[PDB]
Amino acid sequence: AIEIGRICVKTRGREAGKKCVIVDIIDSNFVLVTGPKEINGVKRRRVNILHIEPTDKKVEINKGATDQEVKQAIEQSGLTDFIKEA
């Protein structure tokens, strides 16, 4: 499901297969996402809900969490390198 905290995989764009965390719901077809410490860095901007694939893993954050705040939640669940478990 697509809700706040879900970890997704980018389908289109130059990112194309990188970890990504949903942090906000913008409108009917856009959400706000960010990549805290991607090796190249998934920047903090919008993405179309058709260009992402939700995974099964999830974190616990608040709506519109800052980038620093998100990094603390992935390490709490130990997802810093556990992203590639699927």
Binding site: D24, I25, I26, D27, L32, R45, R46, G64
Partner: protein, 76 residues
């Protein structure tokens, strides 16, 4: 997230009524460029209006705690 309120005149054969059900709209988007593109596509698609005939006059961010319509409040 910056809820925006876009106001302006759109034309079909001398058509101008600046109030709230044949003239203007409300939009929720990150910046002003995104909000304008939404207005062009929604009015151009649903009413067959080319971008010559859409005259946007005022765009400004409104505070989320004061909106007349509750449809845009519910997805916040």
């Amino acid at each position: 997230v910056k809820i925006f309120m876009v106001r302006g005149t759109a034309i079909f054969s001398a058509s101008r009524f600046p109030t709230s059900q044949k003239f203007t709209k409300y939009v929720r988007a990150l910046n002003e460029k995104q909000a304008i593109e939404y207005i062009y596509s929604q009015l151009g698609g649903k009413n067959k209006i080319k971008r010559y005939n859409i005259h946007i006059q005022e765009i400004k961010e409104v505070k989320e705690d004061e909106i007349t319509d509750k449809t845009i409040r519910d997805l916040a």
